[PDB]
């Protein structure tokens, strides 16, 4: 416990399902600048401040970044006790936040805006930790590859990051279909294993 109560007017507040994360805010016109030097984490909507677990090297200078949320919608049917009581309840439930460096600390307005996907930092709700991602650039072009034809694909619960060229992206149906095929195949085999003739059979 820090033992001092901070002024939160000077801190960015990011809210996750189980925690609130505070990072320092240097003044700027569009509110995009971040200091990773001071950070605190708090139980949800309560005000006893505490120091986060930092699992990686953190930046020592001001960085312009963009924030995104990762999570799952929860739709529940709640009990009905009055005539017009709500039939359904929906909650966002964010679990991780990804902060990505603007390129060369450039600003949105500039014609030259892009995002540096090499530097992405993650905040995790369950572990109260901040870490840096490991990206695998499979895009030829080297370190100098253009940043106007780059796309990042995140898979695996936020644990896999890759940069690939734009045109080689998969359509939305293919991603769903690929997954269903894998699961369905494994499940049929599990069923059919019990039969005494499995060793002598062929998938077709």
């Amino acid at each position: 416990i820090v033992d001092y109560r901070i002024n939160e007017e000077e801190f960015h507040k990011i809210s996750l399902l189980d925690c609130d994360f505070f990072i320092r805010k240097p003044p700027d016109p569009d509110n995009d600048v971040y200091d990773f030097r001071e950070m605190y984490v708090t139980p949800p909507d309560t005000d006893i401040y505490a120091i986060p677990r930092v699992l990686a090297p953190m930046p020592q200078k001001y960085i312009r970044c963009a924030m995104s949320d990762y999570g799952c919608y929860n739709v529940t049917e709640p009990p009905i006790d009055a005539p017009r009581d709500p039939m359904y309840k929906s909650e966002r439930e964010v679990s991780k936040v990804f902060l990505t460096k603007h390129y060369r600390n450039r600003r949105a307005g500039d014609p030259e805006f892009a995002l540096d996907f090499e530097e992405i930092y993650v905040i995790d709700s369950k572990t109260k930790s901040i870490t840096r991602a490991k990206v695998v650039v499979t895009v030829p072009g080297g370190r100098n590859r253009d940043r106007k034809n780059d796309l990042l694909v995140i898979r695996d619960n936020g644990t896999s990051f890759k940069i690939i060229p734009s045109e080689e992206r998969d359509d939305p149906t293919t991603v769903i279909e690929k997954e269903e095929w894998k699961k369905s195949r494994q499940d049929m085999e599990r069923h059919l294993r019990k039969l005494r003739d499995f060793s002598v059979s062929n998938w077709f």
């Binding site: 294993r193 019990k194 039969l195 005494r196 060793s199």
Partner: protein
Amino acid sequence: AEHVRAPSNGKIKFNEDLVHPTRTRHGHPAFLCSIDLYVTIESEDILHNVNIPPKSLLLVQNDQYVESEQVIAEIRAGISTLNFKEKVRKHIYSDSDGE
């Protein structure tokens, strides 16, 4: 009241010192378990591990090939005294004449 059946075709391996000898209600030779045991079936593709912690009757012997879906052991987990117990009498009859 539950019957452990066999996961796949293969040889059943277990140590016999741990288990103790018995005769079943239907007349067969069997082994009774009062300690937890691990029994493995060695199918050519994979090894299957099954366990029998409660007092159980193991009906197989080491090195026996067992086919799929064959009852290898009996859990007999329930241990409840019955007030519905009823003693009944059966009569055997003779199929030939004699002394």
